[PDB]
Design an enzyme around this catalytic site. Sequence first.
Site, short mmCIF file in Angstrom:
data_model
loop_
_atom_site.label_atom_id
_atom_site.label_comp_id
_atom_site.label_asym_id
_atom_site.label_seq_id
_atom_site.Cartn_x
_atom_site.Cartn_y
_atom_site.Cartn_z
N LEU A 197 67.12 -57.30 -23.36
CA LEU A 197 66.55 -58.31 -22.48
C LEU A 197 65.68 -59.26 -23.32
O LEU A 197 65.29 -60.33 -22.87
CB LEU A 197 65.67 -57.63 -21.40
CG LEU A 197 66.37 -56.72 -20.38
CD1 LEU A 197 65.35 -56.03 -19.50
CD2 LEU A 197 67.35 -57.50 -19.51
N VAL A 203 63.03 -54.74 -25.59
CA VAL A 203 63.06 -54.37 -24.18
C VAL A 203 64.49 -54.34 -23.70
O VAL A 203 65.25 -55.29 -23.92
CB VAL A 203 62.15 -55.31 -23.33
CG1 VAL A 203 62.19 -54.93 -21.85
CG2 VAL A 203 60.72 -55.31 -23.85
N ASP A 248 48.01 -63.45 -25.68
CA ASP A 248 49.42 -63.83 -25.90
C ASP A 248 49.93 -64.52 -24.63
O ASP A 248 51.10 -64.36 -24.25
CB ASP A 248 50.30 -62.61 -26.26
CG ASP A 248 51.62 -63.00 -26.92
OD1 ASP A 248 51.73 -64.16 -27.39
OD2 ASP A 248 52.57 -62.18 -26.90
C1 LIG Z 1 61.31 -58.82 -23.34
C2 LIG Z 1 60.37 -59.36 -22.32
O1 LIG Z 1 60.12 -58.46 -21.33
C3 LIG Z 1 60.87 -58.43 -20.20
C4 LIG Z 1 61.99 -59.12 -19.99
C5 LIG Z 1 62.70 -59.08 -18.74
C6 LIG Z 1 63.93 -59.83 -18.60
C7 LIG Z 1 64.60 -60.58 -19.51
N1 LIG Z 1 65.66 -61.17 -19.00
N2 LIG Z 1 65.69 -60.82 -17.81
C8 LIG Z 1 66.74 -61.29 -16.88
C9 LIG Z 1 64.68 -60.01 -17.48
C10 LIG Z 1 62.22 -58.35 -17.76
C11 LIG Z 1 61.03 -57.57 -17.95
N3 LIG Z 1 60.44 -56.81 -17.08
S1 LIG Z 1 59.13 -56.06 -17.59
C12 LIG Z 1 59.27 -56.75 -19.12
C13 LIG Z 1 60.37 -57.60 -19.19
C14 LIG Z 1 58.99 -59.60 -23.03
C15 LIG Z 1 58.02 -60.25 -22.00
N4 LIG Z 1 57.08 -59.29 -21.82
C16 LIG Z 1 57.33 -58.21 -22.62
O2 LIG Z 1 56.73 -57.22 -22.64
O3 LIG Z 1 58.42 -58.39 -23.33
#
Ligand SMILES: C[C@@H](Oc1cc(-c2cnn(C)c2)cc2nscc12)[C@H]1CNC(=O)O1
Length: 276
Positions: free
Chosen positions: A18, A26, A133
């Site tokens: 993600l 992530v 951040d």
């Molecule tokens: C990688 C990103 O975190 C997240 C990304 C996504 C996400 C990405 N694309 N899509 C469709 C969904 C959903 C999430 N739910 S809780 C954390 C994330 C960064 C932003 N904050 C962090 O801790 O890392």
Amino acid sequence: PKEVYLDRKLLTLEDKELGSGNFGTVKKGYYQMKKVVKTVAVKILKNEDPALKDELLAEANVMQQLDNPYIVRMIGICEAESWMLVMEMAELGPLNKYLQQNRHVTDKNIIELVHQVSMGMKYLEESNFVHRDLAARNVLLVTQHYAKISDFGLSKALRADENYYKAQTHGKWPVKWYAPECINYYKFSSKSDVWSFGVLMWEAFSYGQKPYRGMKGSEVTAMLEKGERMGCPAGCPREMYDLMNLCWTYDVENRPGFAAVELRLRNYYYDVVNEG
Ligand SMILES: C[C@@H](Oc1cc(-c2cnn(C)c2)cc2nscc12)[C@H]1CNC(=O)O1
């Protein structure tokens, strides 16, 4: 607040990333809770530095101390093939990527989202926490009309008798989001987060464009020192650009805190809704 451990056998992970946070990649996952299979976001510490484990667990600990509708909730930690931080999944993901892919989103909807961020930040400030951040990549959308603040990797809990965190190590910093006192003297306060909030607002009204594109950190510092700022995004309301400029007050003492920022956003949102 005791750490909550999760069972690896009840967690399934997809290989498609993600994205990455400060302290981990992530990935989307599923946590079997009783009879319901819950969709989750799993931050996995690869660590390709022994201090990194302490940074991830500190991030989890910060999240456990916070309870606000505009702050991402963590579910627990999972100590398995790697250290993992399991959190609630924000289905629509980061604000900058969402707006790049959805140019139809209205100015009214953007105002609602950054106002939600200002409410979460007002709560953070009142609680004596600095985010360090704050950027559009860290504002996650639960729905198109519901944003939450994420990535507490660089966050710090200030003691009741201090109003800033002095960084001891100049690490890999997101300088284009940092206030002059952070860059010049390594001092991070809630007012430093207000500066970052102004950059976040510029990113949102620019539909996820990169701030200060192509510029070196030294060129950004020179630009700010002479009183110049990023331009007004196309279609951005004057009141919202004026608020960006107020967040970008050079002198930290004169810059507003989040109570003043949230008030200006709340008022403008009620004017937008009530004009038409
Ligand atoms: C990688 C990103 O975190 C997240 C990304 C996504 C996400 C990405 N694309 N899509 C469709 C969904 C959903 C999430 N739910 S809780 C954390 C994330 C960064 C932003 N904050 C962090 O801790 O890392």
